[PDB]
C-alpha cells in the first residue's frame, strides 16, 4: 500500500507499507528518507498520535492515507 507522509513544511514522501507493519516499521521507512530517528518521530493519522507497537491494519490505514510527521518538541 502506498501512503504519504507529510511534514509541518508540507514536504511529502511516499512510503510503501503492508497492513502487518508496525508503526515502528513505518518510522524506519521515514528514517531512510528523512534521517530522523524513529524514537523522536511523531506520526499523526488523522486525529491521533500513532503508537509504535500497533500496526497499519490496527489503525485501518488505507491507500492514499496521509500521515503527518511532526518534528517539533511537544
Amino acid at each position: 500500500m502506498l501512503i504519504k507522509v507529510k511534514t509541518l513544511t508540507g514536504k511529502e514522501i511516499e512510503i510503501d507499507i503492508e497492513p502487518t507493519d508496525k508503526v515502528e516499521r513505518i518510522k524506519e521507512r521515514v528514517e531512510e528518507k528523512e534521517g530522523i530517528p524513529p524514537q523522536q518521530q511523531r506520526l499523526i493519522y488523522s486525529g491521533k498520535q500513532m503508537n509504535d507497537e500497533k500496526t497499519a491494519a490496527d489503525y485501518k490505514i488505507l491507500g492514499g492515507s496521509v500521515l503527518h510527521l511532526v518534528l517539533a518538541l511537544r
Binding site: 509541518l8 528523512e34 534521517g35 523522536q40 488523522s46 486525529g47 511532526v70 518534528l71 517539533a72
Partner: protein, 250 residues
C-alpha cells in the same frame, strides 16, 4: 571568526519567526542558503488548504504550522550541519550519514590524526540514546576540543531540550577528546551505572544533573553512527550571514 558569535547568531535566527522557518526547513538536498521564505510559506498555505484550512489542520495535526518550531534532535542537527558544511555545493546530511558512516571506535582511533589547522564536525546518530547531535571540533592550537550542538524531544533517557536553551551556554562548553572517546566508543560499555549517568549528564544534560538521565531508556550494547567531515569556518560564517540577509532584506 568569533565561533561563540556564530552560535549566538544561530540563536538569534531561531528566535526570529522567519529565521526559524529558514533554519528548520526539511529540504535536505538543496543548499540551506537557497531556502526562500515566499516559497516556504506558499507550501504551508497549500498544505493547510489540503486539510480544509488552518482550523481543521490544527484539529487534525495538533499544531499550527505557521508558528515557530522547536526542532527535535535530528531536525536541529541535520540543519546546523548543512549550515556549517555547505560552501559551493549542497550537502545532503541524510545521504552522507548513510554513505560516510564510521562508528564510535573508529572515531576514537582517528580523531587524534586530524589536522590542527583544520575544522571538523561530527554528525552523531546515537543508537543507544536514540538521539542525534553535532560535535563541532574547530581548529584549536592549545588543545583540540569538541562542542556539542543538540536539541531533544525528550522521549529517550534525557529531558526535552530546546535548541536555543542548549546553545546559550552548554553548547559553548568545550569537551575534551578524552571525554568524547569515553562517551562514543566501546569504553562506554564498561562504565558503571553511576559513571554512565555522570558522563551522559556532563556531556548532554543542560543542568549536568545525574537524576535527569533515565538509564533504563539507554539501549544497552548499541553503538553510534558518525559522519565526520572537515568544514570551512568561513562557510559557516557566510551561510549565517546569507540567512540573516534574507531577513534584513525582506
Amino acid at each position: 571568526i568569533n565561533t561563540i558569535k556564530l552560535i549566538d547568531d544561530i540563536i538569534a535566527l531561531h528566535n526570529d519567526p522567519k529565521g526559524n522557518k529558514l533554519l528548520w526547513n526539511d529540504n535536505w538536498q538543496d543548499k540551506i542558503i537557497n531556502r526562500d521564505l515566499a516559497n516556504i510559506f506558499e507550501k504551508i498555505d497549500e498544505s493547510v488548504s489540503e486539510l480544509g484550512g488552518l482550523e481543521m489542520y490544527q484539529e487534525m495535526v495538533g499544531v499550527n504550522p505557521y508558528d515557530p518550531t522547536e526542532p527535535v534532535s535530528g531536525l536541529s542537527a541535520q540543519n546546523i550541519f548543512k549550515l556549517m558544511t555547505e560552501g559551493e555545493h549542497a550537502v545532503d546530511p541524510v545521504e552522507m550519514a548513510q554513505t560516510g558512516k564510521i562508528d564510535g571506535n573508529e572515531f576514537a582511533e582517528s580523531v587524534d590524526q586530524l589536522s590542527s589547522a583544520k575544522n571538523y564536525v561530527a554528525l552523531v546518530n546515537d543508537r543507544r540514546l536514540g538521539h542525534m547531535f553535532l560535535i563541532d571540533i574547530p581548529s584549536n592550537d592549545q588543545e583540540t576540543v569538541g562542542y556539542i550542538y543538540q536539541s531533544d524531544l525528550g522521549q529517550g533517557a534525557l529531558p526535552p531540550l530546546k535548541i536555543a536553551d542548549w546553545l546559550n551556554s552548554r553548547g559553548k562548553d568545550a569537551v575534551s577528546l578524552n571525554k568524547l572517546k569515553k562517551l562514543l566508543s566501546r569504553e562506554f560499555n564498561l562504565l558503571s551505572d553511576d559513571e554512565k549517568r555522570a558522563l551522559i549528564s556532563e556531556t548532554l544534560d543542560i543542568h549536568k544533573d545525574v537524576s535527569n538521565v533515565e538509564l533504563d531508556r539507554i539501549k544497552r550494547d548499541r553503538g553510534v553512527d558518525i559522519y565526520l567531515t572537515e568544514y570551512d569556518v568561513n562557510n559557516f560564517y557566510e551561510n549565517i550571514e546569507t540567512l540573516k540577509s534574507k531577513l534584513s532584506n525582506y
